[PDB]
Design an enzyme around this catalytic site. Structure first.
Site, PDB file in Angstrom:
ATOM      1  N   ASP A 170       0.667  -1.239  -0.067  1.00 16.31           N
ATOM      2  CA  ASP A 170       0.059  -0.041   0.134  1.00 16.31           C
ATOM      3  C   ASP A 170       0.785   1.203   0.196  1.00 16.31           C
ATOM      4  OD1 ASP A 170      -1.724  -2.281   0.927  1.00 16.31           O
ATOM      5  OD2 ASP A 170      -2.446  -0.884   2.250  1.00 16.31           O
ATOM      6  N   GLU A 204     -12.036  -2.168   1.861  1.00 18.47           N
ATOM      7  CA  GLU A 204     -10.793  -1.499   2.322  1.00 18.47           C
ATOM      8  C   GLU A 204     -10.447  -0.191   1.709  1.00 18.47           C
ATOM      9  OE1 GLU A 204      -7.723  -4.561   3.221  1.00 18.47           O
ATOM     10  OE2 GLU A 204      -8.975  -5.853   1.711  1.00 18.47           O
TER      11      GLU A 204
END
Length: 538
Positions: free
Chosen positions: A74, A336
């Site tokens: 990420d 998410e």
């Protein structure tokens, strides 16, 4: 081009106050559109989803952005309140979750830390090195720093998970992140539930010709933890989700700061139920399910939500929870990495989901799901026929999904090519590579994919998106391309941010005297004055 199936829920897009209790539902009826859009004839290993909502296929021979120093996943840019992306004194700067390369890629989560990368600003993607030209700056936090907020210091693992980073005119960075403590026995089982918190740490850019150093990040402020009325707690579910803060100003509420994040609906795991509104069927639809059948199916264990919070002070060190803005009860466990993206007077909520996290009876690709409405709290319309899908990995829904560590024999080899996508200005989308390949011939990524381009609001319809296959090479842009569209120039409390065009102009006008200023060299009062005047003009 749709298979027969239920009709999607009617959503009005009507806006509510940020403080109101209305929570939009991504319904089972909505989610079943994903199956209607799939081609039942797509053979073994071919994509069954429409090309317009499928990410371009990433090649299996990819460069590595860190020269294999670390595993990277990420990633986020430096942003302002409008989500513009920034360079500081000539350097693009990104933050990433990193894990030591010696680890198995699937063990990265309990050993995750935030690191940063930098590269020169203002170079077109085609002229950069193949791997994106990023320099790895190392870890943001000194050992033990992020442990400061936890009352219970007996943790077995302590990680930094995803968030976002806001830049100030003085080069200060407010790093919003997920600060997590785990309490595990030697055999991997829990002593008690884990403890993920939304946290802030402030630091600063120190830049010169040689690169970027981050200073500060010495103090961590605990902002939010799951409450149990809006967001599910560890007592309600040992494996509750609570992470990924993204902050922003809403154009409809100037001067206020909001945050979205992933949560779960606040129900005790064992007694959680769904209702008619979660199912979302139009009355009479022959494809409708009953509340009782869904509640008996196991689907009640998938109750993801997207939360909203509002800052109580200008320093962004105190926050209040607001009611969730989207729930996916009996649809998915995990919505998410939520973000709010503003375009043409609409609020777009984008989130990421896995195929395996879909509830019983539901199915869809790994990737980006999105929702549009007239306010940050609205009766959101899931995008693309009410399905919610905006950018799915290539996926054959007619075959089992497999896993990133064990691909299914009949599945598309790009099924896990991309995750933790992030939508950037102009609809550019950056993501990391998880797995590419077939069951007997796959590789793990742990580096960024090529950036791709998703057009938002096609043909005058705000509910539609389409992949731009004319971008780059058949849709694939630069590897790890996370471009800045604003450029901060700052020195000793003076700071201004300018456009790409302005930055080029300023550099041309000032020439060599600017380079010295940006290298942190002493300059005459006259030169300092003329640089600051030119900057103030743009």
């Amino acid at each position: 081009g749709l298979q027969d199936g239920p009709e999607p829920t009617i959503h009005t897009q009507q806006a509510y106050a940020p403080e109101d209790d209305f929570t939009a539902k991504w319904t089972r009826a909505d989610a079943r559109q994903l199956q209607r859009m799939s081609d039942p004839t797509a053979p073994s290993r071919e994509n069954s989803m429409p090309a317009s909502v499928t990410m371009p296929t990433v090649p299996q021979d990819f460069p590595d952005m860190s020269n294999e120093q670390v595993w990277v996943w990420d990633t986020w840019p430096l942003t302002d309140e409008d989500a513009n992306q920034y360079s500081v004194n000539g350097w693009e700067i990104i933050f990433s979750l990193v894990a030591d390369r010696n680890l198995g890629f699937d063990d990265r989560h309990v050993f995750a830390k935030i690191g940063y990368f930098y590269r020169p600003a203002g170079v077109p993607a085609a002229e950069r090195p193949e791997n994106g030209g990023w320099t790895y700056g190392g870890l943001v936090f000194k050992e033990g720093v992020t442990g400061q907020i936890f009352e219970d210091q007996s943790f077995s693992h302590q990680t930094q998970w995803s968030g976002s980073a806001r830049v100030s005119k003085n080069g200060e960075i407010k790093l919003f992140f997920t600060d997590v403590a785990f309490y595990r026995n030697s055999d991997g089982t829990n002593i008690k539930p884990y403890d993920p918190r939304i946290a802030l740490s402030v630091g600063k850019v120190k830049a010169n010709k040689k690169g970027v150093t981050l200073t500060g990040f010495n103090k961590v402020t605990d902002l939010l933890q799951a409450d149990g009325t809006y967001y599910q707690t560890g007592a309600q579910n040992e494996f509750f989700n609570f992470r990924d803060p993204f902050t922003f100003e809403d154009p409809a509420h100037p001067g206020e700061t909001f945050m979205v994040f992933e949560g779960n609906s606040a129900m005790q795991r064992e007694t959680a139920t769904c209702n008619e509104a979660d199912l979302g069927y139009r009355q009479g639809d022959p494809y409708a399910e009953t509340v009782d059948d869904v509640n008996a199916s196991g689907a009640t264990y998938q109750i993801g939500n997207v939360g909203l919070a509002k800052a109580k002070n200008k320093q962004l060190t105190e926050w209040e929870f607001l009611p969730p803005i989207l729930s996916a009860n009996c649809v998915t466990d995990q919505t998410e990495r939520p973000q709010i993206y503003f375009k043409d007077g609409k609020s777009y909520l984008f989130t990421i989901s896995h195929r395996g996290t879909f509830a019983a009876g539901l199915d869809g690709p790994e990737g980006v799901y999105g929702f549009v409405g007239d306010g940050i709290r609205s009766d959101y319309q899931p995008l693309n026929g009410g399905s919610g899908l905006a950018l799915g990995n290539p996926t054959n829904l007619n075959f089992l999904g497999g896993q990133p560590f064990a691909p299914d024999f009949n599945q598309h080899p790009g099924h896990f090519q991309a995750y933790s996508h992030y939508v950037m200005p102009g609809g550019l989308v950056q993501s990391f590579i998880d797995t590419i390949g077939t069951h007997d011939d796959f590789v793990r990524g742990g580096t960024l994919a090529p950036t791709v381009k998703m057009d938002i609001g096609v043909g005058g319809d705000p509910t539609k998106t389409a992949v731009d296959y004319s971008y780059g090479s058949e849709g694939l842009g630069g590897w790890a391309d996370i471009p800045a569209n604003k450029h901060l120039f700052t020195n000793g409390k003076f700071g201004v941010a300018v456009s790409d065009e302005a930055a080029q102009k300023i550099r041309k006008i000032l020439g060599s005297k600017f380079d010295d200023y940006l290298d942190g060299k002493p300059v005459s009062a006259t030169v300092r004055a003329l640089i600051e005047k030119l900057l103030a003009q743009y």
